[PDB]
């Protein structure tokens, strides 16, 4: 049939037949993001997203006809890939100093764009010069980022993700035996590796008081045992009767905590049977009211592009407003309920897309 411009109306599995085009596009998009060039960035991400969706590899400019999200700027890039087999534009970004530095400083936990720019403009070009400079000052988060840099740069496996899962369940079960813990993000979509492990937590019979304290308890608990290397808890900013905004910002979120846990090797059951029997792992935990679990899961399952298109689809095609906490129908003036992701898709009039099919 016809290919939708919306990723939420496309099935995108991990079988990418267009990695050559896709990698160059991701690099160009990333470059624009690091430069805060919104428009260009999103254009590159949309184009890369549609190609990942293809069931065949592009081998001529003709195979492009009919596909949306491919402007003249992008087709020029597709063109070069068809020929050389590589992109001179992507190549240029990979050798760009600002790009190299930002990506490097940014690979440090706690280092955002403002901090990266600062260091770049001071002349810094390597992590070593940064760490040894006896004049710079770092946030608590950045210190932790440097302290465990090595483990954090190392991808996280499914085996490690599952061991982390077990830890979370053992803790959470201790304060809410009826708590539901779901692994979200990349791993839920079937990925083999990730830079961190995310989880959604909810309790059927928890009180507004209980669900609000669980994370503090679980984290305290890990502190007592020395498993907590870094912890930051942000209180929920979601309001029960407030409808999702025009995406004004993402300051709307449930209670969550950015953590770094000490993962003992002995708890990891992989086909790899030492030195320092543990590994630091980035872990994000999210707690939400039982009745909003479907929306949170949908939101945290990603991918980012899938989440972006789900939202604009809802707004531009169905006059609905979507959030990690709700779905509002502006036409019928009512909030729509959902006990599962499928119901949410039904409400939007969208055929259900499985998690492993959301790698847009
Ligand atoms: Mg995360
Ligand atoms: Na970072």
Curated annotation (Swiss-Prot):
Changing residue 253 to A: Reduces enzyme activity. Keywords: Cytoplasm, Hydrolase, Magnesium, Metal-binding, Nucleotidyltransferase, Nucleus, Phosphoprotein, Terminal addition, Transferase. Its cofactor is Mg(2+). A 2'-deoxyribonucleoside 5'-triphosphate binds at residues 186-191, 195-198, 299-300. GO terms for biological process: DNA metabolic process; DNA modification; DNA repair; response to ATP. GO terms for cellular component: cytosol; euchromatin; nuclear matrix; nucleoplasm; nucleus. The keyword rRNA processing does not apply. Coiled coil: none annotated. Can also utilize other divalent cations, such as Mn(2+) and Co(2+) (in vitro). Residues 111-115 are annotated as: Involved in DNA binding. Its EC number is 2.7.7.31, 3.1.11.-. Isoform TDT-L: Expressed in the thymus, and, at lower levels, in the bone marrow. Detected in both cycling and noncycling pro-B and pre-B cells (at protein level). Isoform TDT-S: Expressed in both cycling and noncycling pro-B, but not pre-B, cells (at protein level). Not detected in mature peripheral or germinal center B cells. GO terms for molecular function: DNA binding; DNA nucleotidylexotransferase activity; DNA-directed DNA polymerase activity; hydrolase activity; metal ion binding. Residues 4-360 are annotated as: Mediates interaction with DNTTIP2. Changing residue 252 to A: Nearly abolishes enzyme activity. Mg(2+) binds at residues 196, 198, 284. It catalyses: DNA(n) + a 2'-deoxyribonucleoside 5'-triphosphate = DNA(n+1) + diphosphate. Belongs to the DNA polymerase type-X family. Interacts with PRP19 and DNTTIP1. Forms a ternary complex with DNTTIP2 and core histone. Released from this complex by PCNA. Interacts with TRERF1. This is DNA nucleotidylexotransferase. It comes from Mus musculus (Mouse). The chain holds residues 148 to 510 of 510 of the full protein.
């Amino acid at each position: 049939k016809k290919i939708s411009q919306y990723a939420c109306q496309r099935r995108t599995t991990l079988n990418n037949y267009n990695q050559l085009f896709t990698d160059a596009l991701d690099i160009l998009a990333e470059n624009d993001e690091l430069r805060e060039n919104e428009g260009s960035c999103l254009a590159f991400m949309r184009a890369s997203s549609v190609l990942k969706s293809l069931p065949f590899p592009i081998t001529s400019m003709k195979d492009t006809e009919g596909i949306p999200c491919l402007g003249d700027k992008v087709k020029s890039i597709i063109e070069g890939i068809i020929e050389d087999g590589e992109s001179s534009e992507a190549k240029a970004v990979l050798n760009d100093e600002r790009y190299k530095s930002f990506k490097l400083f940014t690979s440090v936990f706690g280092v955002g764009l403002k901090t990266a720019e600062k260091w770049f403009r001071m002349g810094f070009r390597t992590l070593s010069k940064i760490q040894s400079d006896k004049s710079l000052r770092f946030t608590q988060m950045q210190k932790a980022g440097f302290l465990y840099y090595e483990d954090l740069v190392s991808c996280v496996n499914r085996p490690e993700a599952e061991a982390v899962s077990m830890l979370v369940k053992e803790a959470v079960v201790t304060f809410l035996p009826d708590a539901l813990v779901t692994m979200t993000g990349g791993f839920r979509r079937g990925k083999m590796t990730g830079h961190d492990v995310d989880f959604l937590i909810t309790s059927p019979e928890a009180t507004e008081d209980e669900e609000q304290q669980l994370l503090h308890k679980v984290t305290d608990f890990w502190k007592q045992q020395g498993l907590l290397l870094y912890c930051d808890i942000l209180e929920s900013t979601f309001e029960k009767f407030k409808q999702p905004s025009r995406k004004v910002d993402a300051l709307d979120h449930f209670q969550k905590c950015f953590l770094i846990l000490k993962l003992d090797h002995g708890r990891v059951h992989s086909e790899k049977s030492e030195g320092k029997g543990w590994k630091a792992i980035r872990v994000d935990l999210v707690m939400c009211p039982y009745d909003r679990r479907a929306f949170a899961l949908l939101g945290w399952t990603g991918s980012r592009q899938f989440e972006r298109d789900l939202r604009r689809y809802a707004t531009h095609e169905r006059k609905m407003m979507l959030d990690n906490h709700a779905l509002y129908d502006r036409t019928k003036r009512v909030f729509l309920e959902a006990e599962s992701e499928e119901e949410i898709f039904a409400h939007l009039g969208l055929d259900y897309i499985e998690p492993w099919e959301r790698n847009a």
